[PDB]
Design a protein around this ligand. Sequence first.
Ligand code: ATP
Ligand code: ATP
Ligand code: ADP
Lengths: 250, 264, 239, 238, 243, 273, 276
Amino acid sequence: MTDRYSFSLTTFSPSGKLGQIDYALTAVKQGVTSLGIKATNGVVIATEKKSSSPLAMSETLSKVSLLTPDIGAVYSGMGPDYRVLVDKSRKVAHTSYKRIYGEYPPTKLLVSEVAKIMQEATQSGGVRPFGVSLLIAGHDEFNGFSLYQVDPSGSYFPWKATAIGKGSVAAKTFLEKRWNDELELEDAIHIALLTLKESVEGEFNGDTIELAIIGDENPDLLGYTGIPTDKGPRFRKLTSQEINDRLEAL
Amino acid sequence: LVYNMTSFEQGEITFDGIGGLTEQIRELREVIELPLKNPEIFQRVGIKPPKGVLLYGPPGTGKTLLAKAVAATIGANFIFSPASGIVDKYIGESARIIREMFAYAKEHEPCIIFMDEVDAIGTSADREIQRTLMELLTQMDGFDNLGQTKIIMATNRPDTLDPALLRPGRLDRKVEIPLPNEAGRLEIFKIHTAKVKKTGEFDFEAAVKMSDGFNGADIRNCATEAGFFAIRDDRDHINPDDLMKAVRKVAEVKKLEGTIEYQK
Amino acid sequence: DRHITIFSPEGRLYQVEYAFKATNQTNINSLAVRGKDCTVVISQKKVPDKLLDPTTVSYIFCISRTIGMVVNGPIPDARNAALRAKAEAAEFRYKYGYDMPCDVLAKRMANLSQIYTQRAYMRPLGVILTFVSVDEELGPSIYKTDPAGYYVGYKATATGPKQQEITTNLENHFKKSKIDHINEESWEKVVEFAITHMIDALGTEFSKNDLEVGVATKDKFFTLSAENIEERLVAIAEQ
Amino acid sequence: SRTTIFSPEGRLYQVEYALESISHAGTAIGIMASDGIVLAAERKVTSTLLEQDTSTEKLYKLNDKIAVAVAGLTADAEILINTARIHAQNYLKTYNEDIPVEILVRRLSDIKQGYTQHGGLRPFGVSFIYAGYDDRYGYQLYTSNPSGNYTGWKAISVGANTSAAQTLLQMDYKDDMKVDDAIELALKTLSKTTDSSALTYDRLEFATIRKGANDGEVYQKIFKPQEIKDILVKTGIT
Amino acid sequence: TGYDLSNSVFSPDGRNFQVEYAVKAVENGTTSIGIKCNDGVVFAVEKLITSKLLVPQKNVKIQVVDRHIGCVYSGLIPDGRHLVNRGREEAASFKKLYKTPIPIPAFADRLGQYVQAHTLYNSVRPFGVSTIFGGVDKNGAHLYMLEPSGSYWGYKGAATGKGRQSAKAELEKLVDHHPEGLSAREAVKQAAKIIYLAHEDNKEKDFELEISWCSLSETNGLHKFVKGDLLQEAIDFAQKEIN
Amino acid sequence: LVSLMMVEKVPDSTYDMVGGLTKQIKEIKEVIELPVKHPELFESLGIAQPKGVILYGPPGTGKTLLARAVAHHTDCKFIRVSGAELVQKYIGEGSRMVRELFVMAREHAPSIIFMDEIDSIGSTRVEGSGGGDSEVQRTMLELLNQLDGFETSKNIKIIMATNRLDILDPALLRPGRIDRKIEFPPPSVAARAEILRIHSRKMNLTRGINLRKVAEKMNGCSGADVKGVCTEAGMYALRERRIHVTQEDFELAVGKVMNKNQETAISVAKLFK
Amino acid sequence: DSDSSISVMGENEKPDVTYADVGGLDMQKQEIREAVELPLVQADLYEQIGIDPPRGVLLYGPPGTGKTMLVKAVANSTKAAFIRVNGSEFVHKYLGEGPRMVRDVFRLARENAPSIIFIDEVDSIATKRFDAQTGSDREVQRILIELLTQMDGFDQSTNVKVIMATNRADTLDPALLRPGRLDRKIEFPSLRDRRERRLIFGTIASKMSLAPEADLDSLIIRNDSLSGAVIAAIMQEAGLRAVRKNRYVILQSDLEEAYATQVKTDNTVDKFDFYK
Ligand SMILES: Nc1ncnc2c1ncn2[C@@H]1O[C@H](COP(=O)(O)OP(=O)(O)OP(=O)(O)O)[C@@H](O)[C@H]1O
Ligand SMILES: Nc1ncnc2c1ncn2[C@@H]1O[C@H](COP(=O)(O)OP(=O)(O)OP(=O)(O)O)[C@@H](O)[C@H]1O
Ligand SMILES: Nc1ncnc2c1ncn2[C@@H]1O[C@H](COP(=O)(O)OP(=O)(O)O)[C@@H](O)[C@H]1O
């Protein structure tokens, strides 16, 4: 019971080049492919669940996660450096904002409250960074949709569309064709899947890969009734079947 | 002078000396039948031969013994050439000697060549040595023809290197051999009890009973271990309780330096 | 780089790939399945000397009247995980008024392993685990852990140095009857399938003492003793 | 590399890398007339799909008399503003007057060497531009660096060839050089130093200060895309 | 090579060799055993003399932790004594609780994780000791040994020091001869045999013996060292087994 | 050895094959031309007919291709080492050749030398790691500036050269040991204009030709690219069986440079703005 | 001149491969002979147009992929000189063996007017620029620069323009490749070739044999990881089975296992062990 590693684990280069994050962003690429696109009607994300054995479930693993009733997120790279991060954000949306202004926050203010710990993983002592760069979706009645990519250094890009991982640049070479402005959502799944078909060698079934979306108000989820005022959970995930119903429909 | 390598061939010796895991023993022989005795078949199909092969088995399992037997089957010159043995601080001395190796080799075919411990094969020094690994692999099937001269790499560290194994069309028959069961352990005593006296009974039941992890070398050393102090009995046969007085400690040195053995 | 939990030059963690291999010190294999309304778990029990009290030897623990777990690793490293389990059940129900599930409690101890990879005062643990329980909301289930945090369920699984010898042997089975878990009710009459499969696939024959057993009965977990096993072994009288 | 200690001959191992590292970063300039202020920055990237429209990155504000610019990490600077913002309004609940700058920086950057001085922690990969006004010293302009030493100026650059770019202001700047007579120097100061002479309104970011409102009020005016897009034509690019 | 320099640095083999060096430190120490009799346990130890100037019978190496326990060790004299001073208060903070004596599984469950804690960190020394303990609870008899990697298993007998190879095979030669049950008094004879039988690795030097047992029968399952003719009865006997 | 020596077989180049380069000849000929053209003129003052000079600049230039033509229109000799051939896998071979080198030019005052590369004789440091090459840089510089070099500097000017500048020994340069240096930069656009006029002299009473319409577009560094695009432009005409050629067939040849002008992929790392 | 470090290769001792042993690859095989085979003959046209003959190439792409297969069918159809070399002989144990020989190398070519050469691989030689850290490496870069001046330093036209084979083409020490030093650079891809996989998968089947009880061009339909050097390696293994059982020509059930008999090792904890 004694702490003596309180130095920084971080190191300057001669020419900037902070070392042990620049090595980190290999594993983010070594990890799986995953993406995210918006449109005025709604927003989408997706990944590919690489079930190792023929034994493991995919129900137990959340390669997609809920943040609030109006947000989702997704990663590539490492998992255990993702699972922890959710709860340390969920506990923050309340313990700084949500129990203090009532309403849940807009999307970016949350993002100020994940980089503000991701940063502390580096400039502090006795620690490493999370080998993860993840993605957020946006909604609010005062600023609208958005995506926001983050990264272990502490930055956060905004976007209109992007993707990451072992097939990233090819997608970024692709989607700059597919994207445009005149966009609903029901179209966006074709391109999103059609993208994510080319960058795979294994099976391509609905019970293999999970994704989720940003729909509109869905009070059936809300559980209770009577108040016409409330805005239900815009966030939502899909099932096994509804994936395949798209796939047959190609 | 590499006679020191290539001079262990002339005396004909049986391929029968090892039972092992026969299906693998069926593999390398049948696939190397072809150039010698029935080369008609490659012609009737018109398909290239196996451009050399390798294997894997963990240490001390007759691997070199296995190789050293095959050359006497047909009349090659079985060489002996440790990987680490050809290791010099001089840069070109690495890549120069290998070229002279194939040189004398192709100077004498139909013959045979062998390697074992090649598993060793951005920094400053390392940027030159990969070229050696990049050279020789080229010298397999880069530009030249190879008539009747082949090679095996037979290591004990099967995490050797991705690229030599990354494209297994260069090499093929990337085989494995694991360690015995009773299935294997039992019959191995038959050759090792060949030229020695013994009582006569189904004494080897202890063999399947214990020895679950030994290899062939030590059980052979266990045989002679029993015979040493079996002369205090001095009898004109030998008893299986005899060996039992030393099977323990041989495992206690087999205990010493526990090392793992994965196959790949 | 090769002594601590920083990110590698390329970006793996050399101090962690070791730890998986720190398990395999024992030459031991264990197994996990799902019953119909029950479960099963087993492992070798080696005893290479004469003087022990195998009353004492064990890897299979008891955490509630509900659940259990197993280990294939150094037991000293295990016990620190073993103790921290009993704690982290209590503090759950004391705060909420009901027993500790598995899916959660792995999701705790999987969170825990991460902050042994994210700091450097700590030695990680060279073990892995296979928790077992019934669930009044989820049914028979298990969950596995690595020392990093990768935890996932398994319809049935096993572990040890010799996963390849059997893990293929099981996948061949479900491609012969094709359901998740077995179509047999009593736990007593399905453990036979386990021990039928070990020795046959690639395993070696066993005796009375050679094995140990756990069962997550409905509202009950508990081990088994000698004749309780010998009887269940003599099911082979018919097959 | 043991941030505390010095060289064998009176220098430091790290920090000379830092203000040399930041040279890799973008550009941020800042000038002053006797009439008004201009600022500019070229975003490190100007690809097309992403939200360069509302991308408020290089230029933040602190209160209703001040604006800055940024150069360095996205994050290690992103915290100082949340810090220093508080030290502004926490000046006010004591005193209720507006804040001057000459207290701020002198009472801010001393945090910097506080991490050079001890803890073994790295310094901050950041430098700033400053801008604002008090009623006692008129218009103002300041800068900083990871050391802490701050310098008043009339016009400054940072980043890529700032030493080169600072020349470009040397001959052309005028004492009474008005705003609309000085604004064009900025993007012209950037119209040369650019890597991509192919220039886009998207790629940069902009800000202003004036005293536009009568009764001596001011304006923390910040400029949107299509405005500066049309301003760009005024000097006659296309 | 380069990984064998400090605590908590695993190997490619999957180990920390440093504690495996500790095993050779405890290898450099005195002989010591303790036997699971039919109703309790026994303790006996080697205690070598350098000069006559060392007094006999004022320098015990057994330690007591509480009434119903005896514990010994071998190797590092101080370090094996520290955790006793941890032991002597722990169970005292357990009889504090439900007002009953402490079990033996309670002991190792409250020790065998302790020394582990001195192998997690890069700031401490693994307890280079092997250690024994025993005694009685409501349940009956018990016995255990420790090794510096935290491990421990319930034995019928144990041994340490450089009295390993003699006793281990000897107890293999004992147990089959007498598995039916060995009462307390009788093992006090047969134990002290072994130490006279095991000094032959170090018969350059001399010593004198020290014994303790505890019986549910005799001493109400309390701990009680030997001091009397009963000891002298055994040394008169144990010479014959080596005679 | 005289293989290194100058040639009765001079190359056939010229310093009017060399468009865009207009000023440098005036800035560097005179040290090589004038006071050796007129030592009595220089000796009217006689300040110091300096030692050699140096030229730095990237590839893409033809610093070589400049140095091929200067050996025409000389009045002097122009020897060549075939750079770095002087060294061998021994020690004693170094200094003797350098001893042989100077004397080979002492006998010819109106005569000079050529290096191309001094990247291999640069930045000597030694603590056990180094090499004999460092031994030879001294003695040449020693016999450059010593009791026996100024008599060469009475007889001689010389030149060195490379493509990477600041990666060598500053202890080499006593300015005066090298009295002048110069940049051979990449060209201007309009400097590029007269280039393609040189090499594409193959049009066949054609028309609609706008030679200015290519350095219209370029942002490169080399002038040789004017040839690399030109030389493969005719390849199109060469394959399609029509000897003739035009602008557009000549223009998409930059598509080969569509790689070069765009091969430099870019990182997305917004660690710092 | 003897210069016994490389002899005239292919006077009578040569390999025997053909152009047509390849499948497609005409997306690159066209241009190369558009600057190799013709300058043997139509040199007058290059005098009619083109101030110099476009020549000098850097062939690249991932290795074990198709590069060296093409290098030498041309060797079968030169009617001129040709030389091989191990592409790291220049790393001699002592110094100077290269600079003494490389100057004698092109000495072989200039006498052997005209000719061509090639190289195995230069991955060890690609080195843009270092600070001088030790002579242990600086004997590399000095060879590289000397190679360059030996290529177009002074001798201009009578020489032969040459190749550059590799295993990567981004580490290449620049200032080597130039519009004048090379004037050409080519490669070929690895991604799926529906146009080329559809024919190369059985271009060798003409060289091979088959008695179709069914259709065997269906593994081509199964596009996951279309490669370039495996796709003949498989039947280089699959054919060893009918013979293994005395079967005279294979069947289509014999090879589908032979496809997967090359196990693709998609499951390997060596991938699972590192990040997580
Ligand atoms: N203005 C020009 N006039 C003539 N040739 C030019 C001109 N600009 C470029 N070149 C061409 O550039 C080529 C050589 O220039 P570059 O600087 O790229 O290499 P180099 O000078 O030969 O290399 P090094 O100086 O390292 O030996 C020649 O083929 C030459 O034709
Ligand atoms: N179209 C083809 N025809 C015949 N063989 C082929 C073809 N494509 C690939 N191969 C075979 O694949 C093997 C490996 O490919 P190859 O050696 O050409 O790659 P490479 O880029 O030349 O690698 P290296 O440069 O290291 O030799 C060769 O032996 C070759 O026979
Ligand atoms: N499969 C086997 N059957 C019988 N004996 C074996 C077998 N494998 C090994 N041996 C014995 O073990 C020894 C192996 O020695 P050697 O071949 O020199 O080492 P390696 O196995 O590493 O090549 C031989 O003496 C041989 O008799």
